[PDB]
């Protein structure tokens, strides 16, 4: 925060990496029934 | 009697030339990923 540094071997930032690629696994998932919530009637909260 | 107490002694070296490429391929591994680094003595 100053410019009238002294002499000295200070310590400065550690320069953090940049990334280089992208590397992408699913495993090919398939998908789930989420229309089950609006195939049957619409449940009550005793019996949720 | 210097290399006796040296050597019975559980110390272990922070690389000052090349550890940063050997971590790079324990604690002075942990320097480089946590932002502390020790220093060589004068």
Do not use: H, W
């Not at chain 2, 324990?26 to 680094?37: E, N």
């Amino acid at each position: 925060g100053q410019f009238d540094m002294d002499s000295g071997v200070y310590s400065a930032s550690y320069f953090n990496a940049r990334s280089r690629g992208y590397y992408y696994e699913a495993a090919e998932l398939t998908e789930c029934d989420l229309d089950v919530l609006f195939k049957n009637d619409a449940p009550i909260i005793a019996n949720y | 009697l210097e290399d006796l107490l040296f050597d019975k002694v559980t110390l272990s070296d922070p690389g000052y030339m090349k550890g940063y490429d050997e971590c790079m391929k324990d604690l002075i591994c942990a320097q480089y990923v946590s932002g502390y680094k020790v220093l060589p003595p004068l």
